[PDB]
């Protein structure tokens, strides 16, 4: 066994040397003389009420009008953000739900949690009444994230250190992704939906190929767990949030860390991240009840979205970049412009 | 637009009825190591990632959740239970002498105490191996001194209330084990969450009554704190 350890150490040293060799100048020097964005003064525009318990996940719709939010009172609610009406309200079987997804075509929604089951719901039923249409069983841990590929495929990540691909047609697991040593706390489909990442509790992010089912790279540099992740709009980088109270941006092609957003005042972890439409800002929700808009190309903070009375647990930006929704543990959703 | 408004009224009208049931029921989390005897308690009151046990006392409905089919790294899925009425923490008191189960339970309880998301959630404490601790201490196999140098000068606290016909050593050791957790609890508590030690067996009938009364006390304390009386 010692020889294998020595070989692994030598390979790690070689990778470190290559990463050092492929570095010539920091992104700051390249961005030495870019235009500062200036203070951002976004303000609330809406506020949705009706949830009883704290909110763990919200997802948008491809039309940037409807959205779905999940809480641990056992309810899935579909809001019409423009008019704030409630379109649907789904009473869940198990009240411990930790994620929700909205299908790209809008026909189905999915949600899972401590029950270790992903349930697919039908919204366009013949009678119109929403019914449980599928239950995907086979994960050995709580489900922490799920994402639709199309109306007949879904990718899920559970704390059992594995990500899976499901065939909604027969509900049989089609592929298994392995390699993490800690619970997988999130994932993110690529714009072309051929690659995705995952952030585990080992402080490492891995890049997968959806078809072959083999990991391609591994990015390190965080000090503690990673809670959230999201891909740059152009699909050649991404960002992550960690309990060490910092965010870092990795680039696939260069294969090493690019930037870090840290301030002395901030001593709390990040619970979510997301880029704007053009990928020049970086929203991120903190446990100190606030959000911060980071100047991605200079790392200098731009503004703050204060007004939440409790922890920020979820955060999403519409496809067209018109609105930002932020659920929170106070059971409210706020739309900001 | 009219068709949209009417449904919202119907949907909202439904959430009112669901708001009554949610507010009229209490949620309880059931923790404890595998060999702590919790499953016996659950069966007494009575693949899947979680189990349900709904019972009613004094026409008051409770709702208890037993973890299952999950890994041992609790520091992420534990936060989901930051809004429960109280957490039950069954301990294996007689498991003393893995070699040191008691120390494991001590560290787990200490970690629960100091987590920020749990600095307001009350924790009930069960020491659920009394009828085995009795034989362990009586037979002379215990020798708790070796694994606890601090138990050579321990003297039964003055306010002790031993049960009738009890060997003083048994009560002395039992109270000592309780005293460790009560020493952890009463440091940096700050009068926002509490602990309710309760010696118990594995088939004690009054467990439901004890949990009911402790829940009642928790609600009353919270209400009084709202009015700034306490």
């Amino acid at each position, epitope marked *: 066994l010692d020889q294998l350890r020595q070989e692994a150490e030598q390979l790690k040293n070689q990778i470190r040397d290559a990463r050092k060799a492929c570095a010539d100048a920091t992104l700051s020097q390249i961005t030495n003389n870019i235009d500062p964005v200036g203070r951002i003064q976004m303000r609330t525009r809406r506020t949705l009420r009706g949830h009883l318990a704290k909110i763990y996940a919200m997802h948008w719709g491809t039309d940037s009008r409807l959205l779905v939010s999940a809480s641990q009172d056992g309810k899935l609610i579909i809001w019409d953000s423009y008019t704030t009406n409630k379109v649907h309200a789904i009473p869940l079987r198990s009240s411990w739900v930790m994620t929700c997804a909205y299908a790209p075509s809008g026909n189905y929604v999915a949600c899972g949690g401590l029950d270790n089951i992903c349930s697919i719901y039908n919204l366009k039923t013949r009678e119109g009444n929403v019914r449980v249409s599928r239950e995907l069983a086979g994960h050995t841990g709580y489900l922490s994230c799920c994402r639709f590929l199309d109306d007949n495929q879904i990718v899920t990540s559970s704390g059992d250190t594995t990500c899976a691909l499901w065939d909604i047609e027969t509900g049989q697991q089609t592929t298994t992704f392995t390699g993490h*040593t*800690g619970d997988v706390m999130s994932l993110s489909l690529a714009p072309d939906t051929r690659l995705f990442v995952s952030g585990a*509790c*080992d*402080a*490492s992010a891995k890049l997968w190929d959806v078809r072959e089912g083999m990991c391609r790279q591994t990015f*390190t*540099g965080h*000090e*503690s*767990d990673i809670n959230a992740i999201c891909f740059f709009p152009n699909g050649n980088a991404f960002a992550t949030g960690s*309990d*060490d*109270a910092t965010c870092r941006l990795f680039d696939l092609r260069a294969d090493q860390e690019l930037m870090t957003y840290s301030h002395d005042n901030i*001593i709390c*972890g990040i619970t979510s991240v997301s880029f704007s439409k053009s990928g020049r800002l970086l929203l991120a929700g903190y446990d100190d009840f606030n959000c911060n808009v980071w100047d991605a190309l200079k790392a200098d903070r731009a503004g703050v979205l204060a007004g939440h009375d409790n922890r920020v647990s979820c955060l999403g930006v519409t496809d067209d970049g018109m609105a930002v929704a932020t659920g929170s543990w106070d059971s409210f959703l706020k739309i900001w412009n | 637009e009219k068709a949209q408004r009417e449904a919202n009224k119907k949907i909202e009208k439904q959430l009112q009825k669901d708001k009554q049931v949610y507010r009229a029921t209490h949620r309880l989390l059931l923790l404890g190591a595998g060999e702590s005897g919790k499953n016996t308690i659950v069966k007494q009151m009575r693949t899947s990632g979680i189990f349900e046990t709904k019972f009613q006392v004094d026409k008051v409905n409770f709702h208890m959740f037993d973890v299952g089919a999950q890994r*041992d*790294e*609790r*520091r992420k899925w*534990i936060q989901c239970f930051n809004d429960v009425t109280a957490i039950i923490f069954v301990v294996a008191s007689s498991s003393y002498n*893995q*070699t*040191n189960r008691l*120390q*494991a339970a001590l*560290k787990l309880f200490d*970690s*629960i*105490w*100091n*987590n*920020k998301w749990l600095r307001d959630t009350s924790v009930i404490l069960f020491l659920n191996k009394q009828d085995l601790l009795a034989e362990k201490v009586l037979a002379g196999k215990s020798k708790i001194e*070796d*694994y*606890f*140098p601090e138990f050579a000068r321990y003297t039964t606290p003055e306010d002790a209330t031993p049960e009738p016909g009890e060997d003083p050593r048994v009560t002395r050791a039992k109270y000592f084990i309780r005293d460790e957790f009560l020493r952890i609890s009463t440091a940096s508590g700050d009068g926002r969450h509490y602990c309710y030690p309760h010696f118990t067996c594995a088939v004690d009938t009054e467990n439901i009554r004890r949990v009911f009364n402790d829940c009642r006390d928790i609600i009353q304390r919270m209400h009084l704190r709202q009015y700034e009386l306490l």
Partner: nanobody, 126 residues
Framework: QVQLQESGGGLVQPGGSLRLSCAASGFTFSNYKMNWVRQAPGKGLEWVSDISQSGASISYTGSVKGRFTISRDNAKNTLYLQMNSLKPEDTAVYYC?????????????????????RGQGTQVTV
């Protein structure tokens, strides 16, 4: 990345003494709590000692009190354990452990079967 490297192990007769140095790199040493965890043959993982961020507060397991003196040199980024008065049942691997989050007091999951920030370990035989 997080990487903990130990040293100082070896073989010694009963009542001997050894020093376990823990060379740590890849993070800010002074922001995190620390622990010592050992795994004896045919047994689960165990917890021995700890020390706070600055290094004031200390705590020992039940059956090592008065023998081992945890101490951390935050300047040189290393954790110590001065072993003395060893016994036959001290034989075990010793992992230098790190605590999952900084600035916090709660220190979940250090003893887990697959903790991620735990050291490689050194075998101390008596």
């Amino acid at each position: 990345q997080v990487q903990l490297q130990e040293s100082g192990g070896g073989l010694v007769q009963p009542g001997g003494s050894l020093r376990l140095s823990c060379a740590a790199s890849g993070f800010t040493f002074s922001n995190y709590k620390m622990n010592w965890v050992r795994q004896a043959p045919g047994k689960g993982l165990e917890w021995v000692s700890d020390i706070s961020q600055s290094g004031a507060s200390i705590s020992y397991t039940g059956s090592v009190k008065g023998r081992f003196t945890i101490s951390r040199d935050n300047a040189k980024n290393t954790l110590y354990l001065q072993m003395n008065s060893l016994k036959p049942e001290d034989t075990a691997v010793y992992y230098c452990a790190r605590c999952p989050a900084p600035f916090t007091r709660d220190c979940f999951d250090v003893t887990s079967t697959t903790y991620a920030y735990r050291g490689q370990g050194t075998q101390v035989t008596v």
